[model samples]
Target chain A: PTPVEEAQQKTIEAITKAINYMAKRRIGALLTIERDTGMGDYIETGIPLNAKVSSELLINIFIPNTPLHDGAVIMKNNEIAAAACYLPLSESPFISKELGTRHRAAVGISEVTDSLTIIVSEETGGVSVAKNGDLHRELTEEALKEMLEAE
Target chain B: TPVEEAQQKTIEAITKAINYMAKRRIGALLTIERDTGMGDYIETGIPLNAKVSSELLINIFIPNTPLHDGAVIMKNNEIAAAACYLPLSESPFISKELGTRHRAAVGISEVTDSLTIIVSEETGGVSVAKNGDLHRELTEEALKEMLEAE
Candidate 1:
């Protein structure tokens, strides 16, 4: 089994590659992460040469910590580029105020995959994001200036 | 104010008369009891001929007791109907499991003008009879009986 960090990186790389390929194809694709472990399996399997690719890709990621099922996606040029993440079972002060697990998962997925996740929250409404796990400085007290300068 | 019992009786009489008419016309009509006081007003104020003029006359019997509605109609010279008993000061029930007021109202109207008021006891949801057939609620046995009678 691949380490969780390495698995995450590989998933990101795959998403990037899929986005590039999909951009060339100009069709849309939906990637549903039905299982957590299976996502790692998919990364190990690698993309096939002759596989039919889509311009847009909708990715759904499942994370264990925040929510049982969480995900996100990315769209560019009216096509999805990538997406990843999961939802929390309960409400959280961070990430979203009115979003449920499904929505947060969608947002997280989008943040990770650099894709747009159109999250429909039963409590809120629609949440669209293209990056995963990034903290909003306005919402959080942590300053990103040092981190950006260091990078 | 007319007594509740008297209002009920009048409603029953009107229902019977409308059912008889539906059988003769082979059409449908729905009736809804908005309030018992309204029913009293209709009974006391409106002449019998004027009552006939109202479009699916919605008789309000009381201010808000056992608010109800129903549908009555005749199809192919056959009487078909459905009724609903609604709560006070509420709309009709709309559920996937149960048919809506419009459907029930039309159904009862097709048959007997029974003043089928679709009401929820816990929630004051109200729906009443209109024009059309609401025979979908009829049981197979009831349908057979009606067919045999016809």
Candidate 2:
């Protein structure tokens, strides 16, 4: 396979593994990925880590009792740039009032920057993705993988 | 640095970069921070979080570089970001003669109170965009005065 697709497949695998591991847990997650935009300064606001991206880290960072569990994790160039990074809350009206703080923060980052936010709801055990100011909520694992494949 | 002192330094740095880019016929886009709060968009670019310098700005816009096509954002007289993808204006009234860079400059200014300076890729002419209006063919002196005006 080509290098770009190879890298993208790895990311897809990691995120899919994370979703499988965290779907039924009582924890919520907000993961933002940088696109054509840099998101360098935004990542600097959090603890900078040059660590490789993996499902283990993504799961650990979102679990309760971890200091980095409080905010979003920023993924840049397929690496983990920062953790517990505070994201701006979006001002737009919600698709469903049931959407919580994590989803709001997800849409907020997407609205401003060219970043993509992945959100897993603790209350409903549902998966969602926010991009370009729009939220695609409540997807099955098969749909989730399909959505990410196009990335 | 004090607010006043920082403002002066930013002016000088931008002035130097603009003059140099014009002379070299390099294309550049600079977004100067203003009121109206630049939160989400500011977070878009790669963060420098360093003091502003003409040399650094010049290097970012050099031809054939990866970051040459992106926008640079200056916040509080410091270089906060580089290689930022700014939004392009979709206003129907815009002239077809204007290019993608100019529309992007106008787009940022439309939502925020920032002054965006863009250098022409072909002609080396400079323009400053603010409040959704594009002011074209700016001279080095006019650019400095405009930076100082507000």
Candidate 3:
């Protein structure tokens, strides 16, 4: 599988684990764009607490018009394929810990892979997600999700 | 009560109401001079939520200044009050229905009594309260207690 595919598979594993452990109401996955690197596509992931698992997960690949550094894209993808691990929302949750499920999932992806993941909560109308090695809290998830899910 | 007493009592009632709401951490109330009506003080209330309970509430009183227009003030408090609801935030909880908290507060205040009470999340900042028709500098704790009080 490509770097994107690998990231999705890892997320699937995490979601499956969450389902088995938390017995949550639903779960979903979303793909997003990150800051640009020179060479290729850098796609991120977004997931909700509740979604029906499926073979083909929703994917959003972003090709920014600009690049951050000379080797940023290659370095990011390589890191993702190698050391990426999906930590559960229960374990290794947010550091400040104010972040919710979306944030935790985003952090898991960023820590393990170079890719970013955004998680949105429908309950509190709060949006949180992770990018690179840092996590961003209190954004609008619906807006982010719409952009990712859009064609 | 006489008209003057009723108005005074109303102002006091508004202040008391503001204090009570603040203690619960539900809302806030304030009164400003009509002269300070154009900028911040004139426009009161903050947007909170729709159909759902809000954490912040505001009540404003526009006393009759030299600029009185018959029973109404020279420049209606409604204009200032209505301006509160116009400002929008980058992202709001209820996007489609209402504009934002500030705008909602103004709208609510205009429709209801001269008072403006706005509620928001617990994460929302400090609260303000007043008991008389006149303006008084308010402490954040006093504001919170007033909202918390009945």
- The digit string of per-residue lDDT tens for model 3 on A1-151 reads 6987766555445333322221122222223223343213222211111112221111100111111101111112212110112233424534455545445545654655545454433344344455655665555434444433331
User: Per-residue lDDT for A1-151 in model 2, tens only?
Assistant: 9997788898889888887777777568888988887787778877555445666556655766444667788987667777778888988886578788889999998998887788989898788999999999888889889877876
Off by over 4 Å in 3: A1-102, A141-151, B1-150
lDDT of 2: 0.79
Better of 1 and 2 by lDDT: 2
Model 2 share of native interface contacts:
0.00
Worst 10 residues of 3 chain A by lDDT: A60-69
Candidate 3 lDDT over residue span B33-113, tens digit each: 232243343323221111100110121111111111111111221212211322222333322433234343343333333
How big is the positional error of residue B87 in model 3, measured in Å on the Cα after superposition?
A: 52
Q: Which candidate order results from sorting by TM-score in descending order?
A: 2, 3, 1
User: What is the alpha-carbon lDDT for the whole of candidate 1?
Assistant: 0.31
- Residue A104 displacement in candidate 1 (angstroms): 2.1
Chain A agreement with the truth for model 1, given as TM-score: 0.28
Cα error, candidate 1, residue B35 (Å): 72
Sum up the clashes in candidate 2.
Answer: 2
